[PDB]
Amino acid sequence: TDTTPLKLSNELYAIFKIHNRPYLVTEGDRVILPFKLKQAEVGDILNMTDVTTLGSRNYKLVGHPINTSLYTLKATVVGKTKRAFQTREVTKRRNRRVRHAKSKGDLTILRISELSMN
Amino acid sequence: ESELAKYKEYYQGLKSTVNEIPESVASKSPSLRTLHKRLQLPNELTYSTLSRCLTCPSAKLPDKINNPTKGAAFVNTVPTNKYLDNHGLNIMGKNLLSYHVTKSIIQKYPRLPTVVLNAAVNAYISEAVLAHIAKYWGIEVETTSVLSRYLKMEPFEFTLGRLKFFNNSLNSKDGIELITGKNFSETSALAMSVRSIIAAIWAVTEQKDSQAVYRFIDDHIMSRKLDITKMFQFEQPTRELAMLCRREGLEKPVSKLVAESGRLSKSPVFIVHVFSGEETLGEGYGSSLKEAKARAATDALMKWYCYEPLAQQEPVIDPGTVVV
Amino acid sequence: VVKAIARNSIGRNGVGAFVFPCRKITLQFCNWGGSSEGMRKFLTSKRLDKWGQEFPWIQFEVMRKSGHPLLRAEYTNGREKVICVRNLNIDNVENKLKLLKDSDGDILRRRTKNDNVESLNSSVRGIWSPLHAAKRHR
Amino acid sequence: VIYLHKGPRINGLRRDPESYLRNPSGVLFTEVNAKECQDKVRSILQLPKYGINLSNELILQCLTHKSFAHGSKPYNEKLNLLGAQFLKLQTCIHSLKNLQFSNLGTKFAKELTSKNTACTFVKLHNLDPFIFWKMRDPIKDGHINGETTIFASVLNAFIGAILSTNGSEKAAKFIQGSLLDKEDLHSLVNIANENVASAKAK
Amino acid sequence: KQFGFPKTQVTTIYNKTKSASNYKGYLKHRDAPGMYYQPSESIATGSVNSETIPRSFMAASDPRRGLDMPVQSTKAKQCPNVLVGKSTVNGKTYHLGPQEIDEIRKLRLDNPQKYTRKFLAAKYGISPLFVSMVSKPSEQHVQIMESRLQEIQSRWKEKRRIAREDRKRRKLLWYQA
């Protein structure tokens, strides 16, 4: 795998997958995962492993989780939080009982700190 | 006994602590400790030094205290020691910022125009930006009065931990500012504090790890996003491009239609490329032909200036700005 | 001729040095007031010390007031969450405190489907153009 | 007919290249030689002492001012700016050493990082004939033409070039040695002291 | 061609002509592991990207010069000239001496209405721009012209003034990049 053009390029993107959910990122990008991370606390660093595609403007090294050795991709866990609280009402059409379906899903804000060809 | 006497002795004690910044007292201050932990400051940087960095110069109380009727009262801070303030530190921090940031910018963009470079530097380390950074860190201002503190009967540790300058009480009450100098502005004080911290870090680490300060700066200041492409504003870019081509060993640039669609409409699209020989320099789209031509020239100039070489390359020293 | 446009940088907290979002937490309780029992118990019982030991970048203020028991956090962005912990047991209070510390200070907000990444950066590949496409349309 | 103008100014008319490619000394920009100029400059600056290595082209750029040849040939400005920034920091650390923080906001320190001081240093070292620039009015003292500012720029431009090429530590060492040193006596510190003394007298 | 990577379109599993906006099809499309050449489907106007900068603007010691990415897709022979000056088509001429220039200057001051820039250009086989560069008119004439322009501007409606402002804003925006 001649990964020389990617290495050379100033701009570079990645399409890493957390639980098969793809997230297309550059360095500085701020990923918002739609679940509560249990493993990592806030401040902890995540070394991304299932990286599908690593792309320049005109090239890309894509395939099965590309060899991690070839690259680095460090995210930082920058705040567990939640979505806004919502209460949709559930009811049938001639029925006074109206069940409130309250919802307030969890979020985890990551920040892509490092992304480079090793 | 008398309560005035009790207050007076408390005030005197506070003044003495400010003059000293005794190390034990500084250590006891929770806010300072939390700031230290937050920024991951070196262990060699003592808590007294950190307190000092938050202490702005304030030798004599000004003449504007005499009248709150004219829209100012300075009743929060207490006079400081002449040889234990953030003033010398601040200057050193400013110098460091001016050196390192500028150097980093030059490394990134070795042909960047002088004015553009200056603007970028400003963006990275402007007073407002520095103040914002300080706020983010948690450098809070001593807004509460001395008398109020005494009444609450709070320790001097808390005072030491907060930022200390001649902050005007009733600054914007009833929507009336007084427009005083830089020595009474909050933003300026916050900027000084962030520069003073940097200077303190430098002082402690220089002999052991010389580049510790610069990596701290990189982490905090140089980590911030700035698209350099948004900084530019050209005037007659075609002429400038032609001059650049003349200067280098390049053929005269001419603009040519590559592709065209919707001529005789409200919003056409004209793609023109500024060629020098067979090589294209700049690609320019536009609603009009003229616009497209202009855009191609601007693109070419961007490519010239914002060229960022690799770290593996030997240093690129540019041949100055293209003097049209 | 070239001229600058005065512009300021954007801080990305994570990339260089991570500044921890939660800066200060205030535990507020009442000596009277049966709603403040669990808070009082928490304050008493060696959990707060452990917490402070764990997180020395947060300062932990402890205040007494007449009203309901309060947990007000204070973040780097300047926002302030305030959770009323009325009638909660020790463990519930601790969980609330954990939640607060976890939060980046930003306001709560509805996200649309797949609104995942938030970039300041220009696209690495360009924006599409019909003139410059690989397969021309018809 | 290719009339290249070769005399006083006609507004809008292009000149013969040789009419504007000469410094006040009177050497052609293309005709500069390594043996006769750049080597001499290196020797003056003692670049073999501090492990320094500048390119001949780089040296020439450092020497030449924006006013020379309408910024056509590579001119010191960005380098100068860089050098000034480094120099001021270097002066501050020197002051701190000679930990003190109460000797920065002062006259001597300002003079050390000043433009006049830099010019005097340049004059002493005899780099003034080598630099490339255009005088405002040839028949003047020198200060009227803006000589001092250009000399200061040159001094700082060299520093900026050193920073760019040979790293930061090396540059600092050079600053400590050639400038900012009591043993030379035509160093920057000595000049600053002399200026201070003159100010006191006046 | 330095690199011999296989090249790929930005491939959907669905019909691209009917469902170009459908991200799901793109997500589905897996391609075999390795290096590829995906040429960008974009103009390189705003890009500071290293794959976009031309080789002449790269430094001599740049490794990127040798690599084939600033692709010369267009050809200058095929493209026609746009808003090109007559000097660029048939070369610049430096024929007029000092005396001729002095005469031109004398003429222009004397009577700019009779001896206008275009007329001077026609006479001496040179550009109106060059005439302007050479010679100032009588400042009175300039003042008159400014006054005429002001009068014309006043003669506008509200709408026209707004349109002119918009045009000016657009022009300013063009030179931003």
From Swiss-Prot, chain A:
CC terms in the record's Gene Ontology section: mitochondrial inner membrane; mitochondrial large ribosomal subunit; mitochondrion
Keyword Membrane: no
Main function: Component of the mitochondrial ribosome (mitoribosome), a dedicated translation machinery responsible for the synthesis of mitochondrial genome-encoded proteins, including at least some of the essential transmembrane subunits of the mitochondrial respiratory chain. The mitoribosomes are attached to the mitochondrial inner membrane and translation products are cotranslationally integrated into the membrane.
Assembly description: Component of the mitochondrial large ribosomal subunit (mt-LSU). Mature yeast 74S mitochondrial ribosomes consist of a small (37S) and a large (54S) subunit. The 37S small subunit contains a 15S ribosomal RNA (15S mt-rRNA) and 34 different proteins. The 54S large subunit contains a 21S rRNA (21S mt-rRNA) and 46 different proteins.
GO annotation (BP), single: mitochondrial translation
Record-stated family: Belongs to the bacterial ribosomal protein bL21 family.
Record protein name field: Large ribosomal subunit protein bL21m
Note: Present with 1850 molecules/cell in log phase SD medium.
Keywords, sorted A to Z: Mitochondrion, Ribonucleoprotein, Ribosomal protein, Transit peptide
Curated annotation (Swiss-Prot), chain B:
A biological-process GO annotation: mitochondrial translation
GO molecular function: double-stranded RNA binding; ribonuclease III activity; structural constituent of ribosome
Subcellular location: Mitochondrion
Transmembrane feature ranges: none
Keyword NAD (UniProt): no
Sorted UniProt keywords: Mitochondrion, Ribonucleoprotein, Ribosomal protein, RNA-binding, Transit peptide
Gene Ontology cellular component annotations, sorted alphabetically: mitochondrial inner membrane; mitochondrial large ribosomal subunit; mitochondrion
Residue intervals of the RNase III domain: 73-139
DRBM domain span: 236-306
Family according to the record: Belongs to the ribonuclease III family. Mitochondrion-specific ribosomal protein mL44 subfamily.
Role, per record: Component of the mitochondrial ribosome (mitoribosome), a dedicated translation machinery responsible for the synthesis of mitochondrial genome-encoded proteins, including at least some of the essential transmembrane subunits of the mitochondrial respiratory chain. The mitoribosomes are attached to the mitochondrial inner membrane and translation products are cotranslationally integrated into the membrane.
Extra remark beyond the main annotation: Present with 300 molecules/cell in log phase SD medium.
Designated name of the protein: Large ribosomal subunit protein mL44
Native organism: Saccharomyces cerevisiae (strain ATCC 204508 / S288c) (Baker's yeast)
Swiss-Prot record, chain C:
Disruption of the gene: reported phenotype: Has a respiratory growth defect. Shows complete loss of growth on nonfermentable carbon source and a gradual loss of mtDNA with replicative cell growth and an increasing number of generations.
Short name of any one Pfam family annotated for the protein: L51_S25_CI-B8
Gene Ontology cellular component list: mitochondrial inner membrane; mitochondrial large ribosomal subunit; mitochondrion
Keyword Ribosomal protein found: yes
Entry's Gene Ontology molecular function annotations: structural constituent of ribosome
InterPro entries in alphabetical order: Ribosomal_mL43, Ribosomal_mL43/mS25/NADH_DH, Thioredoxin-like_sf
Record keywords, A-Z: Mitochondrion, Ribonucleoprotein, Ribosomal protein
Record-linked SUPFAM superfamilies: Thioredoxin-like
Primary localization: mitochondrion
Annotated GO biological process: cell redox homeostasis; mitochondrial genome maintenance; mitochondrial translation
Localization annotation: Mitochondrion
Keyword Mitochondrion recorded: yes
Quaternary structure and interacting proteins, as annotated: Component of the mitochondrial large ribosomal subunit (mt-LSU). Mature yeast 74S mitochondrial ribosomes consist of a small (37S) and a large (54S) subunit. The 37S small subunit contains a 15S ribosomal RNA (15S mt-rRNA) and 34 different proteins. The 54S large subunit contains a 21S rRNA (21S mt-rRNA) and 46 different proteins.
Family membership: Belongs to the mitochondrion-specific ribosomal protein mL43 family.
General remark: Present with 3400 molecules/cell in log phase SD medium.
Protein name: Large ribosomal subunit protein mL43
Swiss-Prot record, chain D:
The keyword DNA-binding is assigned to this record: no
Keywords on record: Mitochondrion, Ribonucleoprotein, Ribosomal protein, Transit peptide
Source species, domain of life: Eukaryota
Any one GO cellular component localisation term in the record: mitochondrial large ribosomal subunit
The keyword Ribosomal protein is annotated on this UniProt entry: yes
GO molecular function terms noted in the UniProt entry: ribonuclease III activity; structural constituent of ribosome
A GO biological-process term: RNA processing
Primary location recorded for the protein, binned into one broad class: mitochondrion
Subcellular locations according to the entry: Mitochondrion
Entry's family note: Belongs to the ribonuclease III family. Mitochondrion-specific ribosomal protein mL57 subfamily.
Miscellaneous: Present with 6500 molecules/cell in log phase SD medium.
Assembly information from the UniProt record: Component of the mitochondrial large ribosomal subunit (mt-LSU). Mature yeast 74S mitochondrial ribosomes consist of a small (37S) and a large (54S) subunit. The 37S small subunit contains a 15S ribosomal RNA (15S mt-rRNA) and 34 different proteins. The 54S large subunit contains a 21S rRNA (21S mt-rRNA) and 46 different proteins. mL57 forms a heterodimer with mL44 and stabilizes rRNA expansion segments 1/2 at a membrane-facing protuberance close to the point of attachment of the ribosome to the translocon in the membrane.
Name assigned to this protein: Large ribosomal subunit protein mL57
Complete-protein stretch covered: 29 to 243 of 253
